[PDB]
């Protein structure tokens, strides 16, 4: 009676643990990958992250400058 009215079968907890473990393992591997990706992007700078500004080239004036040699 107690088992019927207060508790559930082993399958529920078993498969819930399976799902929880799967989620947590994915989160762990995601964290490790994210750290490695950050290291690579900060080292090389070829990614979208850690992009530091440079001078905009639309500011350059391309016109004769009173002197042939610029």
């Amino acid at each position: 009676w107690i088992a019927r009215t207060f508790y559930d079968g082993p399958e529920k907890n078993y498969e819930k643990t399976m799902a929880i473990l799967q989620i947590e393992a994915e989160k762990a591997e995601l964290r490790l990958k994210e750290l490695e990706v950050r290291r690579l992007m900060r080292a090389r700078g070829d990614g979208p992250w850690y992009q530091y500004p440079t001078i905009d080239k639309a500011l350059i004036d391309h016109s004769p400058k009173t002197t042939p040699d610029n």
């Binding site: 004769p64 042939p68 040699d69 610029n70």
Partner: protein, 57 residues
């Protein structure tokens, strides 16, 4: 890094205009009216090449 090439002294020898700036200013308007084509050729070449060594002739 590299050697800067320069024309020889013979390449820079030319029959010079040896009149003073007063004479040049007196003649300037008619000089610009008459001698315009070589002057514009030289100045277009000078702003396009951006190099004195490419404009000597």
């Amino acid at each position: 890094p590299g050697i800067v090439e320069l024309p020889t002294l013979e390449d820079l020898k030319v029959q010079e205009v040896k009149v003073s700036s007063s004479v040049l200013k007196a003649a300037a308007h008619h000089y610009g009216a008459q001698c315009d084509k070589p002057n514009k050729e030289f100045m277009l070449c000078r702003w396009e090449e951006k190099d004195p060594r490419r404009c000597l002739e």
